[PDB]
């Protein structure tokens, strides 16, 4: 559910606030889709599902995980490599917008306005560096990736 996305948003903030090189996340389809989007934007370094212990750092991306069956599904966990540049984290803030108490949806007409620094609906304009992620029929895209594809949908989080 959306509660997993809120717990994920806050965890990645606490992990970057603690300057951790690695971080773990529950293995869920929803979490993976947002993680891939963050990776496609350059905010995180790696994505890999494994056990309760992190894989070998030297061969992280080469680590071949075992099949995820019902015998070990409860132990699986997604391991994302955090990014830090110039004495600052690349994933400082991950303020969510859609919460369990209310799922905020945006239209294509609103995303076009928000992508250029103008409020629309329950959202606010994007500034330099900020990034917005929308869950659409074509996967969890970026607000600017959803504008070229001409689709709207659920607004997940806002990255600064």
């Amino acid at each position: 559910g959306i509660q997993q996305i809120t717990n994920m948003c806050s965890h990645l903030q606490n992990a970057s606030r603690a300057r951790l090189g690695l971080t773990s996340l529950p293995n869920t389809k929803y979490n993976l889709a947002l993680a891939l989007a963050l990776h496609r934007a350059g905010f995180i370094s790696s994505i890999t599902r494994g056990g309760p212990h992190p894989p070998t750092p030297e061969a992280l991306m080469t680590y071949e995980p075992e099949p995820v069956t019902s015998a070990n599904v409860a132990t699986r966990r997604l391991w994302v490599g955090l990014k830090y540049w110039n004495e600052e984290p690349v994933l400082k803030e991950l303020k969510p917008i859609s919460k369990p108490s209310r799922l905020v949806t945006a239209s294509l007409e609103q995303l076009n306005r928000v992508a250029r620094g103008f409020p629309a609906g329950y959202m606010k304009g994007l500034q330099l560096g900020e990034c917005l992620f929308v869950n659409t029929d074509r996967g969890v895209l970026e607000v600017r990736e959803a504008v070229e594809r001409k689709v709207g949908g659920l607004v997940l989080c806002k990255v600064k």
Partner: protein
Amino acid sequence: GKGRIFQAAKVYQRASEAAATNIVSGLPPRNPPLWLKAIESIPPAEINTRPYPIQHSPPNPRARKPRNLFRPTKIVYPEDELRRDFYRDHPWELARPRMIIELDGKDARFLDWSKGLRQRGIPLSGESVVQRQLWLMENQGMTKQEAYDKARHEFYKLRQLEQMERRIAVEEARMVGGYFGKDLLTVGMELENKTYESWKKWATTEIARQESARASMYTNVVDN
């Protein structure tokens, strides 16, 4: 938040920006500090970033949500088990003074434990028995007990000859007119005398105080 903000990792960035433009607009910037071009191509290293430390022992494969993932682990070798076993059977082997200060750190380049206990650079110690034991237990496929006996027995025969030389050397020297100084036995007794005397004084002084206290404790206020 009491601590101050250290921007030492950005001195080049800050200093370089301050030298890009001049305060007085319209004029060329003055020459920068002499160190700006020295560290131009030597940026600092990433600090304050907790990585996954080296695992010196297999982590618990049963933990479902383990903690202390960013905590350095203890270094444990197979010899640690043997060292404890040997030095417990030979406790007085620790009284033998052993030097841990290293001269050049290259003492491991000439240690071939296939020859025997006696090596180059290192003294005959309980460590030589452990390494010799470990070698036999690995190459010659010996058991912990068997290899222990072999390396342990070679250790005794070498220690015996060292204790026999001291006696035969002194006796031999005196047969040709060789005299020595005070032995450790006599020197040890003389020190005990000086310390025992100091205790005799303290006991004598304290004994006086206790008996004097008794006189004052008893009531002799009126003499009849």
